[PDB]
Amino acid sequence: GLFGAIAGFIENGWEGMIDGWYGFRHQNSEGTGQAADLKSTQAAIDQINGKLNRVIEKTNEKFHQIEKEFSEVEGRIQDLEKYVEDTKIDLWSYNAELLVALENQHTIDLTDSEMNKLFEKTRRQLRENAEEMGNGCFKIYHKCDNACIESIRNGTYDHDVYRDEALNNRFQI
């Protein structure tokens, strides 16, 4: 993908995450846990649904047309009737082939994009209290209990509360 997250710096996906498309796994002093991020999941789903709604259930109504099967050979007019229809089908077949190719390439890039957006959104919250391990995981440099982890996940994490503690752990051996 264009953003290098899915099938990129995130090595692989999670079969165990059945309640969402994107999410968090953590390890803290209280143990380990998993939770889906609903906002990013919904962003991807909404876009795909919109895309899907533009493609599906839009059909034109045609009634009397030309004939397309013939029981006798007739020559010039029948040649033209057959050629018109064959020309039409090929052009529509091309349209269909290109449509799916463009759409699918885009769907992959868009989902890749949302993964990356969630990563950057989280990075930004954490400010100087965390570093990036390069595999989609942050090392948070302070004691961060289940409440603290949930505060990151629901976007209310206050970096100032933990900054002194984090800066101390980061820049000291």
Binding site: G1, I6, A7, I10, N12, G13, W14, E15, M17, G20, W21, Y22, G23, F24, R25, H26, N28, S29, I48, L52, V55, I56, E57, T59, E61, K62, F63, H64, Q65, E67, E69, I89, W92, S93, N95, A96, E97, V100, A101, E103, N104, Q105, T107, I108, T111, D112, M115, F119, T122, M133, C137, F138, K139, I140, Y141, H142, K143, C144, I149, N169
Partner: protein
């Protein structure tokens, strides 16, 4: 002390392969099919009015082949012609059959008004054992076979103005006898002619004596022609032999009507889109069932499957 927070995305054990710009096949978590490739095998009788031709082609229903009498004044959104339809009246041909079929199919009605043509000096209602109605001989219900009266067949000059505010379709024809003996005993004159005209058009047909293949006992034939008469215009039929006269006109409409060749059974259900293979749903944008379609149908394409990704790239554990 510290903690670790990993961001990630889901994956499924059983992904779907799809096509993209750069990839012939690449696995995503889920996809949806855009090409409708199956049918129930049955034509749904709603919402469109479907008229089953059963043993009758539209043209035989038009002309009035006795076994197609049930179709008098019928109407349809889609007339379905069955492959086991058959003709069972006088052997005939229609020059430019396809066009007459098309234009009647498109009109969507066989509504027929009888008009009082006066045919002075000729015998009406001629029939044949090639076209039995009941036990006795008969003929097309909408055509009037004229023959001599006594020793004479005069020059017919009959007219019929369109004073209505719609177009009239007149179906008529000419009789081709198989022998000269037959020509003279029916029409007196050795050489017949039919001239049917309106103010802006005309057709003149000369019959041709000679043998054709035996059909229902007969080497002779009838040839069918048509004439549309606009409001204000007037029909003139002129003949000194061999005329197969009209009994009146068919009303011409415009709308969503058409015709289809299919042997699919008709069934009680709702489906906007009809194909010769049966009705198909139109939830998908494309279909691979048949290039012949009627109604709100997906576009026909050559592909049998096209998968639209409905999820991210699938990267399993």
């Amino acid at each position: 002390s510290t903690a670790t927070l990993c961001l990630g995305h889901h994956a499924v054990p059983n992904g779907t392969l799809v096509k993209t710009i750069t990839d012939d096949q690449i696995e995503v978590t889920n996809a949806t099919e855009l090409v409708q490739s199956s049918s129930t095998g049955k034509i749904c009788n709603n919402p469109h009015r479907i008229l089953d031709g059963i043993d009758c082609t539209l043209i035989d229903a038009l002309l009035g082949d006795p076994h197609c009498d049930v179709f008098q004044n019928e109407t349809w959104d889609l007339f379905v012609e069955r492959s086991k339809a058959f003709s069972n009246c006088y052997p005939y041909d229609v020059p430019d059959y396809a066009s007459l079929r098309s234009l009647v199919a498109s009109s969507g009605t066989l509504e027929f008004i009888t008009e009082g043509f006066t045919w002075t000096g000729v015998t009406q209602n001629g029939g044949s054992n090639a076209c039995k109605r009941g036990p006795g001989s008969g003929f097309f219900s909408r055509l009037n076979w004229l023959t001599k009266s006594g020793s004479t067949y005069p020059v017919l000059n009959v007219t019929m103005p369109n004073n209505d505010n719609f177009d009239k379709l007149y179906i008529w024809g000419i009789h081709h006898p198989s022998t000269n003996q037959e020509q003279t005993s029916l029409y007196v004159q050795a050489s017949g002619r039919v001239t049917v005209s309106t103010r802006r058009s005309q057709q003149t047909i000369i019959p041709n004596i000679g043998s054709r293949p035996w059909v229902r006992g007969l080497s002779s034939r009838i040839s069918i022609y048509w004439t549309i008469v606009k409001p204000g215009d007037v029909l003139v039929i002129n003949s000194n032999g061999n005329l197969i006269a009209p009994r009146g006109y068919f009303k011409m409409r415009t709308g969503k009507s058409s015709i289809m060749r299919s042997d699919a059974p008709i069934d009680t259900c709702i489906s906007e889109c009809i194909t010769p293979n049966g009705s198909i749903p139109n939830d998908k944008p494309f279909q691979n069932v048949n290039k012949i379609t009627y109604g709100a149908c997906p576009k026909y394409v050559k592909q049998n499957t096209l998968k639209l990704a409905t999820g991210m790239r699938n990267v399993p554990e």
